[PDB]
């Protein structure tokens, strides 16, 4: 079973959007789709819930007026829109569902909503070398960028975001002596919003 | 609404001992509670339903336990690999309602941060800027001081800091410390200096470069 949401969306103030959450690996009209949003110290809310055999929904009324459920049988996907869009509405979306069978859950990745009016700004990528290596990712905006050694998991260490000057920086570290060089250590590193990939080799 | 509070937001353990977190509904909602686990960068998954059965492979080391308003989130031989924030909810009536989360802290032998600088790469220099990265990787505890120095002389102008959440396998912190200057002004000078300050140590942890 899974859940495939977007990774990102960059939508002006007063604009709306529309959030896929397409599902696969079970049968979709079998389990209620559920929606929650997160924002920093905000916790967890609930959204609402739909059934897909036949799009009977639940609201939580603090989202009645901006949140609209639906969803497309034939293509097993869900959707949620969101209406008069402000900055109170950037947060992560998530898509969930309950599955019986035993009793499992399954979430999308959620998809991480900017409301603003600056534009998309692809990330710079810079090599750091000096065995602890790294990475600097500067100046792009918004939220997220997904950095990825390789692939390498171990002493890796992404430090999240600052805002400088309304752009975003974060550096990665990757820590791996006879390594390198040798070994082609690459940074892998994606800006969903601006549709921009970059590979960067860190060289001596 | 029915609010439910979880009136820790942060609880500190050993890896091996057991942590309860507590969560208390506004209303009566029998045990329609549920618990939930989210790891960082990850999506939240579900631990327990009904406040006592278990989802799919979570361990019985999570022991749901209470009816009515009170609701407890046990934790047996908690691992450095359960860092997390937890968060009860209640589905028993609308709107389904969250706690607002409980963060667990790992405690540790106290441990010395892993010092590199970076000079600024050769690229960025070809678009006017200039930014040295210090990183300070896996120590413990949280608190740790950076000090930048420029051919001797301090620097607090135009520092970038950030910190990593609590790492799961080894419950140490990491935290990177970038320097950005001009080309020009980078030029001007010669020794950058990344200075840590620990409790580990009594003098600074020094890591320097000539241009
Ligand atoms: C966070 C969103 C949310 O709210 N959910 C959720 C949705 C998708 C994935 C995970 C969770 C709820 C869905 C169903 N409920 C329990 C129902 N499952 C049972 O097995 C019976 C329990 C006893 C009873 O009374 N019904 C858990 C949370």
């Known amino acids: 079973v899974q859940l495939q949401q977007p990774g990102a969306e960059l939508v002006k103030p007063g604009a709306s959007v529309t959030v896929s959450c397409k599902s696969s690996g079970y049968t979709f009209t079998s389990y209620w789709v559920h929606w929650v949003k997160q924002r920093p110290g905000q916790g967890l809310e609930w959204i609402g819930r739909?059934?897909?055999?036949?799009?009977?929904?639940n609201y939580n009324q603090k989202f009645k007026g901006k949140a609209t459920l639906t969803v497309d049988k034939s293509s097993t996907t869900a959707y949620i829109h969101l209406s008069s869009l402000t900055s109170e509405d950037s947060a992560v979306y998530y898509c969930?569902?309950?599955?019986?069978?035993?009793?499992?859950?399954?979430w999308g990745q959620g998809t991480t909503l900017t409301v603003s009016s600056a534009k998309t700004t692809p990330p710079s990528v810079y090599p750091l070398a000096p065995v602890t290596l790294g990475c600097l990712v500067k100046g792009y905006f918004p939220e997220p960028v997904t950095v990825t050694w390789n692939s390498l998991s171990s002493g890796v260490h992404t430090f999240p975001a600052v805002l400088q000057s309304d752009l975003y920086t974060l550096s990665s570290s990757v820590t791996v002596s006879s390594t390198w060089p040798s070994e082609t250590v690459t940074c892998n590193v994606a800006h969903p919003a601006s549709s921009t990939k970059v590979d960067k080799k860190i060289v001596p | 609404d029915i609010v439910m509070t979880q009136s820790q937001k942060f609880m500190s353990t050993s890896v091996g001992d057991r942590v309860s977190v507590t969560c208390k509904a506004s209303?009566?909602?029998?045990?329609?509670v549920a618990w939930y686990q989210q790891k960082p960068g990850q999506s939240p998954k579900a631990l327990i339903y009904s406040a006592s059965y278990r989802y799919s492979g979570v361990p019985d080391r999570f022991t749901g336990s209470g009816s009515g308003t009170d609701f407890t989130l046990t934790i047996s031989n908690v691992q450095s690999e359960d860092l997390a924030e937890f968060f009860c909810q209640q589905y028993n009536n609308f709107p389904y309602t969250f706690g607002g989360g409980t963060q667990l802290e790992m405690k540790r032998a106290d441990a010395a941060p892993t010092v590199s600088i970076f000079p600024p790469s050769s690229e960025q220099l070809t678009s006017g800027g200039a930014s040295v990265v210090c990183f300070l990787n896996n120590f413990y505890p949280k608190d740790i001081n950076v000090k930048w120095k420029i051919d001797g002389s301090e620097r607090q102008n135009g520092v970038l800091n950030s910190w990593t959440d609590q790492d799961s396998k080894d419950s140490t912190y990491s935290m990177s410390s970038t320097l950005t200057l001009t080309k020009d002004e980078y030029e001007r000078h010669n020794s950058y200096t990344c200075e840590a300050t620990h409790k580990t140590s009594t003098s600074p942890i020094v890591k320097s470069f000539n241009r």
């Open positions: 209303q009566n909602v029998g045990t329609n």
């Open positions: 969930a569902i309950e599955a019986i069978t035993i009793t499992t859950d399954y």
């Open positions: 739909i059934h897909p055999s036949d799009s009977d929904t």
